[PDB]
Amino acid sequence: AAPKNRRTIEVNRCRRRNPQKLIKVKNNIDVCPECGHLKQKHVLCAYCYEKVCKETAEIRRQIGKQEGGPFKAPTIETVVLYTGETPSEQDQGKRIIERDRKRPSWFT
Amino acid sequence: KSDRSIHLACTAGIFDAYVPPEGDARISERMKKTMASQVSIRRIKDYDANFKIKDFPEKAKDIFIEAHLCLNNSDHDRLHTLVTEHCFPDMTWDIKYKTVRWSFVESLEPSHVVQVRCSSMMNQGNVYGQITVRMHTRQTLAIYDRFGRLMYGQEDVPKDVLEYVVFEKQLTNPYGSWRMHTKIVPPWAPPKQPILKTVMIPGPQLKPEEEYEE
Amino acid sequence: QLSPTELTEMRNDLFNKEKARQLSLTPRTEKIEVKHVGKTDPGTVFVMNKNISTPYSCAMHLSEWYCRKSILALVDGQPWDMYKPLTKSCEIKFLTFKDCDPGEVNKAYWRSCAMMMGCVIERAFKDEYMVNLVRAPEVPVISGAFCYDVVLDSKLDEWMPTKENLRSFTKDAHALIYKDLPFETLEVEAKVALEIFQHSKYKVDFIEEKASQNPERIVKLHRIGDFIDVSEGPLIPRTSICFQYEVSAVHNLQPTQPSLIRRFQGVSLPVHLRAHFTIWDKLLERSRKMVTE
Amino acid sequence: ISRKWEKKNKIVYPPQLPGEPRRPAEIYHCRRQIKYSKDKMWYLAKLIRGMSIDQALAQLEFNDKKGAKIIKEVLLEAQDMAVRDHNVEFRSNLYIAESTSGRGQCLKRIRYHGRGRFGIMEKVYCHYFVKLVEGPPPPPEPPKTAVAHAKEYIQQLRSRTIVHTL
Amino acid sequence: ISHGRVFRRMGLGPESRIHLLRNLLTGLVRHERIEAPWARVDEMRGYAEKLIDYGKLGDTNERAMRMADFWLTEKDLIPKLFQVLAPRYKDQTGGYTRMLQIPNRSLDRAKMAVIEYKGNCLPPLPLPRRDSHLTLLNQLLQGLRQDLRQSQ
Ligand SMILES: [Mg+2]
Ligand SMILES: [Zn+2]
Structure with a gap:
């Protein structure tokens, strides 16, 4: 089957600018208040999540350096310590992951 | 390695800049500064024996006034005639799409030839002479936008200005002329008239992994 | 005796002349520096105009979101109106409804709603009867209602408003909300507030006690359109912040002599914290219940 | 090709009398040769027509299109040139007056079909144009009321004349 | 018709x-x-x-x-499972995992999600938090709760 006639620009404009084809305005945009950045109400904030991802990427690099090779996952729990504190008396039999920076304020 | 080189008409430096004396505006070694100023006066007299330092300050006042009037009506060839090439862009670029309404009211006291220096021979065969003149006059200014609304100053109100304006001539130039080279504003100068709009200075833009430190 | 119309424009004229006097006292432009020290967009410097610029102007420099969500401003730790001019180079911090401690924002909101209800009462009762406004008690948010004390006519000493009358009050308040007037602020001399409110002995007593509590005898006046009132503190920017509004109940106070003081109670909720129909009905019933200070 | 949008940005006005409205600022910006279709870029521009600048930036940040990211960059640099060179007081006090996409210079490549047949592919390019005007966004036109409809019907009925006679 | 079908059709098959x-x-x-x-x-x-x-x-x-x-x-x-994760959740009954939605993949715009075991050593996610109890609406509802308490 082939077009019997050429569709005009008026019919084309009606089809292409029908409101179903247009982009719907989003109402769920909110200012994430921890960093003042735009987020959607149902998703995580992109800025805060990228912050957490870069920090945990450094954590995982340190874990890999301490592990030293594949197939060596520990049988004990793990805690992360920064510079300037000692491991607490609850973190006795836990693998220590040391980080060379201050503890971030959002990490407790 | 072509024979043709750039024939500069001026420089962009001030030979032994006149440090403004403190309290010169507040109040309504001298032999050494005087003999240097007059050494350069001798050199300029040698390269042109028809210079009167007493006859300079009214010509400097003129060059100032018609330079700012050509700045008023965007008369760029006459700005080149009365204004050095180092003086032109920092006089025209910031007003390229703005309307400047400048006027000269009066002079509070006559301008004073306060400094004369001269360059050395080794500047590509060219010898330049610079003269710093203290100007203390009364002027008006009203800078407008691209859209004709006002930026800075007031239309009619005249205010006092003090300035150490420095002129330069290429003495080795057969067709050289005395043109405005720079202006020395003192480090102790009073603060400028405030602008009529508001400015936000943004803080440090932070990548996510960075932390704000005060 | 002055008619309600003419007392209205004379109060408006006095307010406008005092505002013009302050603007003439600051005739030349002057640059102050404002250090935004908020958690978001930290360490941001504005170079504002002295006694002309507003925290709303700072928010408009930053973004539209700060304009639409910022209800109060902390200027050097003190609550500041969003349309109140800045005097001194300070540090600013915008406060919204959804902060960790929105208590100051709540106090400003409830004071604004009380002053709106007082305006509604004053321009709701008839010309042949007499209305006087005593004060808005600083009632906590936890009580559930804003109270305005009104001295009414001895001809209406026996009269009790009906449900359609309360709904008419609510409709007038919604008309004010739709009209969307800014909350204009004026820090004024106690003398000047006295000739503004000279035809009200209760307003004179309130102005005198505010002048007694502060050393310089400077009180705070607020205006929405034509209604001027003495405030206990800062207010919200615009009446359009209010979304759900109702004048719930009217009560008599216990001492009938020497005069009958009627406490009007209402309840309101902003756009940013609008509630559902059922939750709003329960808040309505609690607001209809008695509130004692 | 033509660059009249940039020349529109370089247009200048005479100084203003002190007794007339303030003539709000106009800022013209464009990006040329975008590897994107002008129709899809039209959908994005028709989305951000008439919005405030921050509303447009929010919508483009949470849209899912390459054109949305490109237009967001263009809007940000237009806002920067607005409050850097055109004396716009507040960076949030702008709205999008004009926002449209045009055709760019494209390229013809072959598309190998079956048999010995072939087609011509078009490496489509497009331009994006934006105009930012200082001030709050204009209010949306309120929908026509029944009072206005009755009024226009009565105006037609009172504009009736006796035709084809004296 | 996929009424009562609890499993998604994924990959190249059930394999x-x-x-x-x-x-x-x-x-x-x-x-x-x-x-x-x-x-x-x-x-x-x-x-x-x-x-x-x-x-x-x-x-x-x-x-x-x-x-x-x-x-x-x-x-x-x-x-790791039998001597780490089960002793970590010996007290809990079934709430071991946390799923949150992260916006969109930067390439094909796929709806993204982050899933973690609760507890952990990693930096915490920016979890969505409810409004504070000192909010205006929460204070009115708390006062209503008190009024109901002294009423009954
Ligand atoms: Mg598949
Ligand atoms: Zn965030």
């Missing part, structure tokens, strides 16, 4: 569906927090909850041993 979910479960047990497309995260979340239940059944159980052997493909995570 590839179970193998994809097994690889996601393995990554989750190893790193304690992974990101993946939303549908895959949902299915793997169900499997992760059941796997922690088997770990709490314990290593001496041969059935739990066989299940962990199948569903963990590196054989060092089986000590």
